[PDB]
Amino acid sequence: PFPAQSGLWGRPTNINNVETYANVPWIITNGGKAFASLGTEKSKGTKVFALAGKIKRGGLVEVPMGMSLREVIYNIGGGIKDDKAFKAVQMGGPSGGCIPADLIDTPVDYESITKTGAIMGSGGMIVMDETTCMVDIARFFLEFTCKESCGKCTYCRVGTRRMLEILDRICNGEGRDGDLELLEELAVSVKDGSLCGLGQTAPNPVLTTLRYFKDEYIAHIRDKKCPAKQCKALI
Amino acid sequence: MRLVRVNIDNKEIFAEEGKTILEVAHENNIEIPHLCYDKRLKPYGACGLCVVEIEGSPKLARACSTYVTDKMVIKTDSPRVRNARKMALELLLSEHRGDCRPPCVLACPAHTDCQGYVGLIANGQFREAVALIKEQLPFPASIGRVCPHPCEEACRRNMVDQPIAIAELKRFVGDIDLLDDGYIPPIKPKTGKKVAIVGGGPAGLTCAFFLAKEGHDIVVYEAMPKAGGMLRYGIPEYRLPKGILDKEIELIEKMGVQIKTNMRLGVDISLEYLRKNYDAVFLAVGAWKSSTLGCPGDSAEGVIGGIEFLRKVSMNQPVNLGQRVLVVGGGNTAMDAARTAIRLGAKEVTVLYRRTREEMPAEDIEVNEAEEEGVKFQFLVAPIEVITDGGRVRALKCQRMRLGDMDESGRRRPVPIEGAEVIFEADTIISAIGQKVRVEDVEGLELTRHGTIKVDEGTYQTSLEGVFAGGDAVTGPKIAIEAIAQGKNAARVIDSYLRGKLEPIKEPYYVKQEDLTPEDFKDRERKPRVPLKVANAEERKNNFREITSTMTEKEAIAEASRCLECGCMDYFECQLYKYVNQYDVDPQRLSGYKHKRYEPQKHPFIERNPDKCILCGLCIRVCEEVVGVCALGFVNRGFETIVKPEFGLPLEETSCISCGQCADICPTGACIGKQPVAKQVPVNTVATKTVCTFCGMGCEMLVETKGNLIFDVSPVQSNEGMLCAFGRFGIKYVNDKDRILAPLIKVNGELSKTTFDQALIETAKKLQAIRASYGKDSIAIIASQRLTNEEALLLTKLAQKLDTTVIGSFDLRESVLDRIFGLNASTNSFDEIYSTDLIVAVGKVAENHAVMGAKLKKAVELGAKLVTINNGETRADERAIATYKIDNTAFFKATIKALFEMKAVDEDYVSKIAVNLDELKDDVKNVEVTDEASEFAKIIAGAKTAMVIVDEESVSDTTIGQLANILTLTQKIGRPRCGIIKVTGLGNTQGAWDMGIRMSKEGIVKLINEGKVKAAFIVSEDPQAADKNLGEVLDKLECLIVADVFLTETGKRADVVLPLVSHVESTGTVTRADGKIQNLNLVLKPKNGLSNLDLLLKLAELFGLQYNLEKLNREMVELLQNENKYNQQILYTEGFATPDKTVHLFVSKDAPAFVEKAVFDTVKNRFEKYLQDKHLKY
Amino acid sequence: MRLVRVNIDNKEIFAEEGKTILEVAHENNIEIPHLCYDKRLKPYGACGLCVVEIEGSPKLARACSTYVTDKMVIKTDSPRVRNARKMALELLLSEHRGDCRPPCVLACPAHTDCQGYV
Amino acid sequence: DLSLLDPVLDEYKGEKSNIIAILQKTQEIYRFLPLDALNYISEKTGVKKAKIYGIATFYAQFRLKPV
């Protein structure tokens, strides 16, 4: 039952973001053709991002769709602070994913970002260097999402908590065997079973950190240490 | 409409459009799990159990929300769906803090419902407790006498004071059952299958018991002269008397089991014969070959096996003892042999065990008792030689041993000590070091290395096809309840095999609490355990009389009342437990932080437990959408969400009306309704449909009982499936122990018990004396309005027999509708509320009748318009278009004048159908029309169809007459969807009025005050308690006869008090507020054996009235037909019931619009007083 | 789908949408005469026996063709309906050449089924 | 005190869809949401008390303890 057909008090409502409403008058005054000439074939126009983290120059950037992430990180963001190696970008926010260093050339686009697991989300790209540890980052955003759940459906209300304790056990080194398979199964079951988008995008960090940084988790749980040396319990 | 073609689980269905997948699967016998779905509420989507895989869609679709379309292929059991549901159930369990079955049940090898029958004992239901035992244990008394009771080692009351005497209680109820005729469970129809059981021991007899229940033909071949096994030829008489065993075996034989004794396998009968003439064979031969001493000289005369010696003793065969007896062993056999030898005249008996006291397999109590009797013990001593002189044993040489290292058991291994040897002088040596399966009996079978029969675990099947085994023959010597459990499991497996599909035993998964500690019970009251009566050692060491004696009934109830009720009360109706059993859920992997937020409450009806809440929201949605009170709500957000009442207040301090819908809709026992019994116990009840009698809405309900006690009440899913506080919770008076069951008559100025015949004779003679001395019309009959139609008609007949026209009720109000329309009845039915255009709810319609409030809420949601006329606030004012707060009937006169002024009355038709119109116009010609009256008249005139709902018990008759006038003027009477509906105060007010009880309280009181009425026959009313001013009026009666359920304050001043039974103990017919005739079924048999109709029929036969239920029903039907009221949904369709066949418009003077009156019905008044004392609403 | 509220012969019914009055009356134990109605065929309207009086409509409505709507009051035995059905039956009988019972049965005072047992 | 909420309840009257604004104003005034103030809001505006407590405890900005 959609808001366009039944929204506020049962009457049709159109709920849109601020950015699309801001893009509308430009579309009207310059015509649709001018707007459609910017961006890829799937995504037209420009998108706003909030560069932060270990980037040299944070803030708001309005980039055409399809501009490579490497260009945004280096050319616009000014590179990594203190000229350290660039590990991953936490794109989308607490419900986004960690796009790794080798996928730095995936163009900015809904389809191209989503094909890497992450989501466009709140356009908040958190640039991170090789110092940062992936388990803590995944546990950091999952904690926020678990705190921000509303608690209606079982998969998001209690599944996110089980994932958070699993991640905490992994980071503390006190994790039992079978933690990686159980965590992955829990994440894919929460993602495919939750009702709203806060649960379907809740395990996006974990999943992404299990697609590109599985070795980080494996060294965390087996060797009882982290290569990034950021977990306080392991330093 | 269009028929959509769908395919669910490879089965083509032609469903209707606009239906959800859940409804289609329900109506086509396809099971889809659901926890947060109710038909009366909009979809929620929380639990995510109803996910089904739809072809063409990538995501699993919820069956509770998705609507079936054309060409839909739905798979409700695909592996993706199963994995999704299993993960959801595991996630729900990860936050669940409950106990599906108490530790006592889990510790019992037979898994007997220990909590169930303990709680049934605490309620006085001994036969139900025995029946519950016999569902898993065919020998309550025998096993209760002889059992190490591991259940008491796991009893949670160990954490407070002392474990519950479960074995003693079971022995007590078994003795009670055996004292009278025993209990035989129902037997299924004969299946024509023959099963051969070899052995008459606990395992074989248990298999026979649980296979004869399935309808098979059972024959038990027993080698010994009498069945019983080691329960007879083992355990001695002072521990298990053989009369009890004989009685239990006779009970088993009463089920159709043919026990052929003296038949031995391999000697008298052959295994091939059994395999040929029988479908299945179950071998329960047991371990009947005592182990030899294993030392040189063990074959010398004077050395006898333990079980052989005990069999000789039990059979009264001559055995050769002496002054000196040695016993080698440490089990039950050794201790029994030692104590038997002590009682058989041996001067000294010494038991030699190779281990120490702590590692004795025998119970500590048995060893201590034997020490009291005079048995000596030598530990860490093992035999090595038998010193025999002339072929007879003179002594035995033992080698002292010491605890050296660990062993297979893991505790401690005894090893011999070199140079340590002791000679023990003994005329007799009894080797009781254990028993082994007799190889001769088990010929032609594959044997385990231990010597026992080898069977497939979980199926109890031997190497030979169709031959099963169990008991001591398979597991070796164990306790008797293990053999009984093996027999029961083998019986179930054998029944499955006979049906064709052999299925191994599957153990269910239970949710259990393992974090419990004694600090959780620091607040529980400490109660001493039941004392054990044990015979004196000196007097008992000489005879074979039983040592311990059975508890008394008082002690049994006091012991069973010590139970902590550890198991979940919702076990037999929990759906989460069913679903986690249906799926291979592994909860340990996802186990983590779990809330502990349950705090005890003082609400007498509803108990809420946050630890078992799956947050489906059903309670909130049903309190907000159906009931309309909105007393519950979500609190916090996320993992910390909790369902709480208004501001987290106790349920009594909120606006909750104690309807119990939240308890009835909860799936997982978090919200429950407390049972109306002495001790709470989770039992499998039986539900019977009956009709509530506490007001005229006539809500049907399912009363769930177990024995002669009512255990719960559930609403019927007819319309909104709702019950108010009365119907749901005031059924507690049925179990009330203050009910009188025998009549009382005045002897020496005090009421004392008598027989029914004498009491009814006294009643008849007193009434006849009053009639003779004071003439006709001198006896008043004040009958309650909760009686059936037949009882009211019989009371009218009796009043005619007594020549008295004073037939009335104190609950009856002055009638106005029969002087206007002709009949005092509701014109229309409850089914036209939904389809009417305007509803005028007058009085406390929603407050007094919560079900009617829900009906009005649903009708307004469907499109109706509600106008509430009252004096104070009403719950219906939220959705009312117009609300009027009035205190006088001048409002209705002004409304009539406003209707006349705006020409909203068609004077031609009204004058055609209603006499008395010009005088009504003259009466309303002078009143002043107010703004509210004008608005009300505009609303009424603009409505095509109108229904006036009047709370008869809170609205004065002047208001009813004025509303009837208003309906008649606007022509809203005698047509479909238009009319007036009176919600009567009691269950059968309409039926009582139709039968002839039509005298109000005021008339009867006036007649008494004048002195015209000198005697009263009050049937289930409480004039003294309800009204204080009536206390003087009742002082004017020469004779008072009371027929009441309880000894009320008005029954204590009577001359004869006759007991009545509840409405669940009396069958008959009642009449709803709209005139619908409903049936009162018999949920329970009458407690005193006499129904209300039976008592009144006896009293009437004393007057020469020959009647019964069928004759009275026929007369009632004829009476209803003569008034054109029988099975008529709308009244006055053809013409009104006045003799003129016209409406006599109500013309009168102004008066208060609403009145407040008491309740004179005994049970309703008592429950209202209870609710007021507890500060509850309704 | 929606549940329609109708009233047939002073009895409130909660029927389903897209149903004819004939189906609703059949499933609610209300007898409506019909001669040219079959469930597998489209409505015909020839015999005119299933006419019912619907409140708000001036003409009698065929129950085999009219669809139940919300707030429908149907009278299937009103004198107008009875007269219409009686006239239709008389018209049908006027062109009928048959013998319901043979003269042998009618001549017997006990009306024994002479043709039957013969 | 309860008169401090009198203007707020007067401004946001006539509609029971402005309960969150009233709760925020009460949170600003009293620095917390006392059960007596929530009771006063429930009585004055006509929204059910359970709804008030649910909307109050839903957000982390609303605290029910004195500061």
Ligand SMILES: Cc1cc2nc3c(=O)[nH]c(=O)nc-3n(C[C@H](O)[C@H](O)[C@H](O)COP(=O)(O)OP(=O)(O)OC[C@H]3O[C@@H](n4cnc5c(N)ncnc54)[C@H](O)[C@@H]3O)c2cc1C
């Ligand atoms: C001395 C003693 C004391 C005990 N005390 C206790 C106690 O206090 N508490 C407790 O819980 N348990 C006690 N037990 C254990 C209990 O008695 C047995 O474990 C239980 O009876 C096992 O029963 P069963 O059916 O496996 O075999 P049994 O009862 O040992 O024998 C079953 C039947 O098989 C029959 N049978 C054998 N061979 C054949 C054949 N070839 N053909 C036909 N029928 C045959 C026998 O006649 C016998 O009737 C005691 C046992 C003994 C020996």
Ligand SMILES: Cc1cc2nc3c(=O)[nH]c(=O)nc-3n(C[C@H](O)[C@H](O)[C@H](O)COP(=O)(O)O)c2cc1C
């Ligand atoms: C947890 C969660 C938070 C969201 N937050 C926002 C938000 O802050 N702004 C927004 O425009 N959409 C947000 N959305 C998405 C909205 O549900 C919805 O898709 C959006 O209003 C659509 O706007 P659009 O048509 O302009 O894309 C959020 C979704 C979820 C699941």
Ligand code: SF4
């Ligand atoms: S997934 Fe969405 S709807 Fe479900 S509990 Fe989380 S926030 Fe609430």
Ligand code: SF4
């Ligand atoms: S609520 Fe259900 S699942 Fe939970 S303990 Fe009780 S019976 Fe078991």
Ligand code: SF4
């Ligand atoms: S049979 Fe034994 S273990 Fe089972 S409940 Fe009775 S005493 Fe306890």
Ligand code: SF4
């Ligand atoms: S207290 Fe009652 S329910 Fe709990 S373990 Fe003991 S007998 Fe069983």
Ligand code: SF4
């Ligand atoms: S019992 Fe009280 S809280 Fe439960 S549904 Fe009824 S009114 Fe609401």
Ligand code: SF4
């Ligand atoms: S308490 Fe309410 S929300 Fe919790 S399980 Fe029961 S019905 Fe559902």
Ligand code: SF4
């Ligand atoms: S509304 Fe009346 S009939 Fe229904 S449950 Fe309550 S008292 Fe009984």
Ligand code: SF4
């Ligand atoms: S003659 Fe035959 S067809 Fe004609 S009405 Fe009689 S039975 Fe029917």
Ligand code: FES
């Ligand atoms: S999601 Fe449909 S029943 Fe719960």
Ligand code: FES
């Ligand atoms: S059945 Fe003949 S007209 Fe309808």
Ligand SMILES: [Zn+2]
């Ligand atoms: Zn680390």
